[PDB]
Amino acid sequence: PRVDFPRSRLRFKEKLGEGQFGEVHLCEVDSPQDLVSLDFPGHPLLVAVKILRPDATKNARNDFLKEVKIMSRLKDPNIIRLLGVCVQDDPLCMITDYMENGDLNQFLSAHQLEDKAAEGAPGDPTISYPMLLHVAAQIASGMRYLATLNFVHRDLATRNCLVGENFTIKIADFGMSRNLYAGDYYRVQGRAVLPIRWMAWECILMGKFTTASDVWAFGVTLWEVLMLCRAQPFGQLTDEQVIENAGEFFRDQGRQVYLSRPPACPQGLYELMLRCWSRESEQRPPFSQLHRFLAEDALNTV
Ligand SMILES: O=C(Cc1cccc(C#Cc2cccnc2)c1)Nc1cccc(C(F)(F)F)c1
């Protein structure tokens, strides 16, 4: 915010990822204790530091400074936060918590649903159905916070969520240029890149994102979680078929198709997903209600 983090205290250790106007490195802080405040909570402390890419242009710099401004709006346990910045002079940095379990798509991909609940040792690559709910509830809480600020994410998906120790989830936004998730985006020259498989029908037709389209994307993201990210949404359809599907929602003649129920997903939970994909934006559930259902109702056996 007002005072720059001491850049001299960072020791860079490895690359975590690379985006459109910046890249993220793991760093160590030699003495973490004397930097502590309310904005700044083995023996070395690890942080993740985003910096400008080496091919940095004036345009990338501008995008970096705006990113700092945008992220400064956001303070919530389940939204990524800036511990510190270096923007008074070069090189420019954004410092955040190191989330050691990486993005949620890669994390869930490496796990399997538990055969029998709580029968395994710590560390085994298994995850329980209640943990999936807990993961989902956290994303919903993060989205509830964003909705109160009238802040529209525009690209919610597991690939933009981070996983910390003890399964804390934080929503982030890594942009749309990563090689790893290129199949998730539909590109046309001179047009905005679009994650159509997560997009409400009205966005595909009008390109207008709202809190209600964020709810639709949360429905798809929840589907991802319950699939343990084993398949792409609408995976057996082409991009063009997925775009045509939005036209079918528009004409409203009952020919639109939906994501199928995941194996780990009970029918009651799947009805919630379907409500997120309601044709009319007003009928999609608010995040406060999505969170309530995921934190509580979903624990019912009746
Ligand atoms: O998330 C970003 C980009 C960004 C910036 C600084 C650090 C990191 C990281 C990291 C990392 C990676 C692996 C392990 N641990 C940490 C990511 N921007 C952004 C822009 C607008 C809105 C939002 C939000 F909050 F609404 F989602 C987020």
Side-chain angles (χ1 to χ4, degrees), residues 48 50 67 71 74 79-80 96-97 99 153 171-174:
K50 183 166 162 167
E67 183 158 58
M71 292 181 74
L74 316 174
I79 302 304
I80 187 169
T96 185
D97 307 270
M99 308 292 286
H153 190 281
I171 296 161
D173 189 345
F174 290 95

Side-chain angles (χ1 to χ4, degrees), residues 1-10 12 49-52 61 64-65 68 84-95:
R2 232 353 218 158
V3 181
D4 261 7
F5 182 90
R7 193 191 290 96
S8 64
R9 307 282 300 283
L10 303 160
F12 288 72
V49 176
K50 183 166 162 167
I51 52 175
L52 236 32
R61 186 169 175 105
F64 195 100
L65 295 180
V68 165
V85 303
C86 317
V87 289
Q88 308 301 335
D89 60 356
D90 283 30
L92 306 170
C93 324
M94 293 183 252
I95 302 157

Side-chain angles (χ1 to χ4, degrees), residues 55-109:
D55 67 340
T57 31
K58 179 191 178 181
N59 292 4
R61 186 169 175 105
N62 181 70
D63 278 353
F64 195 100
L65 295 180
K66 293 202 285 186
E67 183 158 58
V68 165
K69 293 194 183 199
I70 301 159
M71 292 181 74
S72 300
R73 294 173 61 180
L74 316 174
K75 340 286 193 203
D76 177 88
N78 293 118
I79 302 304
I80 187 169
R81 74 173 191 270
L82 295 179
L83 302 172
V85 303
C86 317
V87 289
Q88 308 301 335
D89 60 356
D90 283 30
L92 306 170
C93 324
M94 293 183 252
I95 302 157
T96 185
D97 307 270
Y98 176 48
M99 308 292 286
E100 52 176 44
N101 274 308
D103 83 50
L104 172 65
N105 191 310
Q106 295 188 106
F107 178 90
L108 281 178
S109 287

Side-chain angles (χ1 to χ4, degrees), residues 3 54 88 137 200 221 239-240 258 288 295 299:
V3 181
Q88 308 301 335
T221 301
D239 288 353
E240 295 64 31
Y258 299 94
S288 55
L299 291 178

Side-chain angles (χ1 to χ4, degrees), residues 15-24 50 53 80 101-107 153 155-163 170-187 193 195 198 224 232:
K15 282 186 76 176
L16 291 172
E18 34 179 309
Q20 182 54 54
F21 50 87
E23 52 177 38
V24 185
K50 183 166 162 167
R53 275 151 52 102
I80 187 169
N101 274 308
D103 83 50
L104 172 65
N105 191 310
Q106 295 188 106
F107 178 90
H153 190 281
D155 189 22
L156 178 63
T158 57
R159 64 180 178 271
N160 277 322
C161 299
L162 293 168
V163 191
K170 292 184 171 198
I171 296 161
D173 189 345
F174 290 95
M176 311 192 265
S177 290
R178 293 186 293 174
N179 254 262
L180 191 47
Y181 298 110
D184 292 346
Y185 297 95
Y186 173 73
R187 304 176 171 81
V193 181
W198 286 255
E224 280 179 281
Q232 187 185 46

Side-chain angles (χ1 to χ4, degrees), residues 146-216:
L146 297 183
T148 65
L149 305 176
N150 295 319
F151 184 95
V152 179
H153 190 281
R154 299 164 313 161
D155 189 22
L156 178 63
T158 57
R159 64 180 178 271
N160 277 322
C161 299
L162 293 168
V163 191
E165 304 178 343
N166 283 112
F167 296 84
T168 50
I169 301 301
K170 292 184 171 198
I171 296 161
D173 189 345
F174 290 95
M176 311 192 265
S177 290
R178 293 186 293 174
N179 254 262
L180 191 47
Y181 298 110
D184 292 346
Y185 297 95
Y186 173 73
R187 304 176 171 81
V188 165
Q189 212 156 59
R191 283 188 209 169
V193 181
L194 309 170
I196 53 174
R197 288 156 197 279
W198 286 255
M199 284 169 57
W201 66 272
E202 68 270 14
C203 313
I204 290 181
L205 300 180
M206 270 81 86
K208 171 231 201 339
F209 302 83
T210 65
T211 296
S213 58
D214 275 355
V215 172
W216 181 295

